[PDB]
Design a protein around this motif. Sequence first.
Motif, PDB file in Angstrom:
ATOM      1  N   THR A  22      67.062  49.043  -7.573  1.00 25.28           N
ATOM      2  CA  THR A  22      67.470  47.686  -7.937  1.00 25.28           C
ATOM      3  C   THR A  22      66.488  46.913  -8.769  1.00 25.28           C
ATOM      4  OG1 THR A  22      66.447  46.776  -5.863  1.00 25.28           O
ATOM      5  CG2 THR A  22      68.869  47.481  -5.846  1.00 25.28           C
ATOM      6  N   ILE A  23      65.130  47.446  -8.739  1.00 26.18           N
ATOM      7  CA  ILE A  23      64.132  46.921  -9.478  1.00 26.18           C
ATOM      8  C   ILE A  23      64.013  47.349 -10.923  1.00 26.18           C
ATOM      9  CG2 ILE A  23      61.514  46.731  -9.796  1.00 26.18           C
ATOM     10  CD1 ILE A  23      61.114  46.936  -6.847  1.00 26.18           C
ATOM     11  N   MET A  24      64.661  48.403 -11.472  1.00 30.66           N
ATOM     12  CA  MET A  24      64.542  49.028 -12.614  1.00 30.66           C
ATOM     13  C   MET A  24      65.984  48.795 -13.311  1.00 30.66           C
ATOM     14  SD  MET A  24      64.951  53.248 -12.287  1.00 30.66           S
ATOM     15  CE  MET A  24      63.318  53.990 -11.798  1.00 30.66           C
ATOM     16  N   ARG A  25      66.978  48.456 -12.726  1.00 31.30           N
ATOM     17  CA  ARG A  25      68.576  48.308 -13.002  1.00 31.30           C
ATOM     18  C   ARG A  25      68.430  47.383 -14.354  1.00 31.30           C
ATOM     19  NH1 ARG A  25      73.789  49.284 -11.839  1.00 31.30           N
ATOM     20  NH2 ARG A  25      72.877  50.332  -9.916  1.00 31.30           N
ATOM     21  N   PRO A  26      67.705  46.225 -14.339  1.00 31.27           N
ATOM     22  CA  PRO A  26      67.876  45.310 -15.401  1.00 31.27           C
ATOM     23  C   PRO A  26      67.097  45.689 -16.755  1.00 31.27           C
ATOM     24  CG  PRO A  26      66.911  44.191 -13.445  1.00 31.27           C
ATOM     25  CD  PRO A  26      67.150  45.581 -12.945  1.00 31.27           C
ATOM     26  N   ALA A  27      66.172  46.881 -16.508  1.00 31.76           N
ATOM     27  CA  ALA A  27      65.497  47.394 -17.813  1.00 31.76           C
ATOM     28  C   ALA A  27      66.703  48.212 -18.725  1.00 31.76           C
ATOM     29  CB  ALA A  27      64.452  48.289 -17.573  1.00 31.76           C
ATOM     30  N   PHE A  28      67.852  48.477 -18.223  1.00 29.01           N
ATOM     31  CA  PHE A  28      68.832  49.509 -18.822  1.00 29.01           C
ATOM     32  C   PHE A  28      70.052  48.797 -19.221  1.00 29.01           C
ATOM     33  CE2 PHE A  28      66.630  53.440 -18.258  1.00 29.01           C
ATOM     34  CZ  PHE A  28      65.796  53.085 -17.203  1.00 29.01           C
ATOM     35  N   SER A  29      70.621  48.833 -20.443  1.00 27.60           N
ATOM     36  CA  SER A  29      71.799  48.541 -20.785  1.00 27.60           C
ATOM     37  C   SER A  29      72.717  49.265 -20.058  1.00 27.60           C
ATOM     38  CB  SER A  29      72.055  48.894 -22.238  1.00 27.60           C
ATOM     39  OG  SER A  29      73.423  48.955 -22.520  1.00 27.60           O
ATOM     40  N   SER A  30      73.998  48.728 -19.586  1.00 28.70           N
ATOM     41  CA  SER A  30      75.024  49.403 -19.027  1.00 28.70           C
ATOM     42  C   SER A  30      75.266  50.571 -19.713  1.00 28.70           C
ATOM     43  CB  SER A  30      76.222  48.435 -18.886  1.00 28.70           C
ATOM     44  OG  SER A  30      76.742  47.736 -20.282  1.00 28.70           O
ATOM     45  N   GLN A  31      75.343  50.704 -20.905  1.00 30.21           N
ATOM     46  CA  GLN A  31      75.733  51.942 -21.933  1.00 30.21           C
ATOM     47  C   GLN A  31      74.728  53.014 -21.978  1.00 30.21           C
ATOM     48  OE1 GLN A  31      78.855  51.186 -24.969  1.00 30.21           O
ATOM     49  NE2 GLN A  31      78.015  48.974 -24.612  1.00 30.21           N
ATOM     50  N   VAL A  90      59.610  44.802 -19.669  1.00 23.89           N
ATOM     51  CA  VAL A  90      60.989  45.503 -19.288  1.00 23.89           C
ATOM     52  C   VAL A  90      60.564  46.886 -18.733  1.00 23.89           C
ATOM     53  CG1 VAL A  90      63.253  46.487 -20.369  1.00 23.89           C
ATOM     54  CG2 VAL A  90      62.254  44.308 -21.257  1.00 23.89           C
ATOM     55  N   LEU A  91      59.836  47.305 -19.459  1.00 20.70           N
ATOM     56  CA  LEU A  91      59.325  48.789 -18.910  1.00 20.70           C
ATOM     57  C   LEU A  91      58.567  49.001 -17.857  1.00 20.70           C
ATOM     58  CD1 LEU A  91      57.872  50.413 -22.268  1.00 20.70           C
ATOM     59  CD2 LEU A  91      60.453  50.851 -21.566  1.00 20.70           C
ATOM     60  N   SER A  92      57.878  47.876 -17.205  1.00 22.75           N
ATOM     61  CA  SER A  92      57.077  47.574 -16.236  1.00 22.75           C
ATOM     62  C   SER A  92      58.050  47.905 -14.900  1.00 22.75           C
ATOM     63  CB  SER A  92      56.464  46.177 -15.984  1.00 22.75           C
ATOM     64  OG  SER A  92      56.034  45.998 -14.733  1.00 22.75           O
ATOM     65  N   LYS A  93      59.452  47.070 -15.188  1.00 18.06           N
ATOM     66  CA  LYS A  93      60.345  47.279 -14.158  1.00 18.06           C
ATOM     67  C   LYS A  93      60.829  48.745 -13.634  1.00 18.06           C
ATOM     68  CE  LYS A  93      62.414  42.973 -15.504  1.00 18.06           C
ATOM     69  NZ  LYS A  93      63.311  42.397 -16.625  1.00 18.06           N
ATOM     70  N   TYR A  94      60.834  49.369 -15.083  1.00 19.99           N
ATOM     71  CA  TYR A  94      61.237  50.793 -14.784  1.00 19.99           C
ATOM     72  C   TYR A  94      59.903  51.566 -13.990  1.00 19.99           C
ATOM     73  CZ  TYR A  94      61.279  55.817 -15.791  1.00 19.99           C
ATOM     74  OH  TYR A  94      61.223  57.247 -15.913  1.00 19.99           O
ATOM     75  N   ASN A  95      58.656  51.282 -14.378  1.00 15.95           N
ATOM     76  CA  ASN A  95      57.719  52.066 -13.434  1.00 15.95           C
ATOM     77  C   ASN A  95      57.471  51.406 -12.040  1.00 15.95           C
ATOM     78  OD1 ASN A  95      56.765  53.439 -15.719  1.00 15.95           O
ATOM     79  ND2 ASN A  95      55.572  51.550 -16.759  1.00 15.95           N
ATOM     80  N   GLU A  96      57.822  50.088 -11.871  1.00 15.80           N
ATOM     81  CA  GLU A  96      57.821  49.715 -10.650  1.00 15.80           C
ATOM     82  C   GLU A  96      58.920  50.233  -9.526  1.00 15.80           C
ATOM     83  OE1 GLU A  96      58.391  45.155 -10.413  1.00 15.80           O
ATOM     84  OE2 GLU A  96      58.207  45.316  -8.342  1.00 15.80           O
ATOM     85  N   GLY A  97      60.203  50.196 -10.337  1.00 21.50           N
ATOM     86  CA  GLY A  97      61.537  50.549  -9.479  1.00 21.50           C
ATOM     87  C   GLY A  97      61.073  52.140  -8.823  1.00 21.50           C
ATOM     88  N   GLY A  98      60.588  52.884  -9.969  1.00 22.77           N
ATOM     89  CA  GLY A  98      60.237  54.207  -9.654  1.00 22.77           C
ATOM     90  C   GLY A  98      59.171  54.404  -8.620  1.00 22.77           C
ATOM     91  N   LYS A  99      58.182  53.622  -8.828  1.00 22.91           N
ATOM     92  CA  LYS A  99      56.977  53.682  -7.688  1.00 22.91           C
ATOM     93  C   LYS A  99      57.451  53.350  -6.461  1.00 22.91           C
ATOM     94  CE  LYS A  99      51.994  52.929  -7.180  1.00 22.91           C
ATOM     95  N   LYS A 100      58.368  52.286  -6.448  1.00 18.47           N
ATOM     96  CA  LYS A 100      58.696  51.855  -4.838  1.00 18.47           C
ATOM     97  C   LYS A 100      59.934  52.517  -4.635  1.00 18.47           C
ATOM     98  CE  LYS A 100      56.709  47.282  -5.446  1.00 18.47           C
ATOM     99  NZ  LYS A 100      56.965  45.674  -5.727  1.00 18.47           N
ATOM    100  N   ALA A 101      60.581  53.496  -5.313  1.00 19.34           N
ATOM    101  CA  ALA A 101      61.830  54.246  -5.190  1.00 19.34           C
ATOM    102  C   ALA A 101      62.950  53.450  -4.732  1.00 19.34           C
ATOM    103  CB  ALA A 101      61.498  55.200  -4.132  1.00 19.34           C
TER     104      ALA A 101
END
Lengths: 124, 124, 124, 124
Positions: free
Chosen positions: D28-37, D14-25
């Motif tokens: 859409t890559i990070m969004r699945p890592a976070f609750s809608s709330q 899950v946290l990989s998606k955050y680091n990946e979405g961040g690095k690639k700017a």
Amino acid sequence: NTTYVQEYHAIVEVLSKYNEGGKKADSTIMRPAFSSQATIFGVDVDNKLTGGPIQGLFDVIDNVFHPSPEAKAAIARIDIVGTAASARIDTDDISGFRFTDFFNLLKVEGKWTVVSKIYHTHPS
Amino acid sequence: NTTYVQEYHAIVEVLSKYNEGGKKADSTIMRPAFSSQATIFGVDVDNKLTGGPIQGLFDVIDNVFHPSPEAKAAIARIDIVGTAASARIDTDDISGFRFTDFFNLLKVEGKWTVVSKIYHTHPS
Amino acid sequence: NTTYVQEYHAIVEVLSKYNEGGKKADSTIMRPAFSSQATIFGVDVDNKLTGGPIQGLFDVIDNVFHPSPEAKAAIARIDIVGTAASARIDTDDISGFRFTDFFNLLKVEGKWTVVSKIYHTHPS
Amino acid sequence: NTTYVQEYHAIVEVLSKYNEGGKKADSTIMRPAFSSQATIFGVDVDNKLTGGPIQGLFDVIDNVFHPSPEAKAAIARIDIVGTAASARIDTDDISGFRFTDFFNLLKVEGKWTVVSKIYHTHPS
């Protein structure tokens, strides 16, 4: 001056060798992670302190453990403050065991080294 | 059949003796906290490993430190898994020093004991 | 500039209000520890996200909890990096429950404040 | 019926998606890592609380950040207790910034999700 991230990746490189030596049951691979002054301790089935010189770990690894292709380790935590660090490693399915290990590390002459490992053996 | 809170408080009772013994510059107070086989290590100004048997700590407390009523300690973290624990303690204004200490502890014969202390000495 | 021990002490003063409010079942004691923006979340019996605004915590404390003189809390860990901090609190015997809580805190206009609490409810 | 190692690896995915979405700017890559709330907060240059809904994070990732091939992230710590977890991530050289992030996660319907992120921005 170095960053948290730089020291983290240096420490993971050292702890990597520990995890690889454990999984391959080859002490030669893990030996470089440890200071000559390192100790290993845990508590035995009678709740008594057990361990001593790090060579005791290398002995168990070489003589008692079996290669464990399905072993999986998690480096749960690395706390780093200057020249000192602590780390937690959790390992499943290592020669029939599940462990939690706690390491004290120091950055000696520019390289991180383990000076103390302790462990808890989880019930089977 | 112990809770995290119960074990935490037990470990704090042990670590308290170390904090108290350091602030009072009295090795007799802290001695009960440590296994006879405990070690202390850090890194000297030349980045070399410095330390050895925990008796060396007691000698420094008794022969170098003086009572530091202004000393302030924070038990920043205690990680507890079964019979094993890790702790971090930060101390300000202890005989002119600021330290971060990492401790490895084991629950030996029902009582928590320190088997390794490492430290970083903060500048200035 | 501030030390780790100083920031630790400040955060414990805040988190202490939380522990006292819980133990006394009085949300007014804990209210000052939380940002107006703060949220609370955990997972219900059906594994579903439950919570929202921190007032939901205050409502449980005021309407559901009873004073728990035998409640015992441990501030297991506080990680501090500049303006941000994380904390873990374990509590036994609070209105018949045992919790582990995780807090995200920020240092806002000189003062630490909670912006998010989550929790796990342990078996009775 | 799950081990720490098992949950750790689930959380890192899950946290990989955050680091990946961040690095690639790429949010859409990070969004699945976070609750809608989920919420994000930090402190601005005036030491005031800044942030709110996690959509604000995604806006900065898409509209401010650029792909950062040099970016290096370290998952410093993951504390896991039942359905709750906290994580610390440190990132160097991400669109010119150095961050330390603290995450609160919950295991919702079998899947780990971020409900809160906070951060400290390190100086240049």
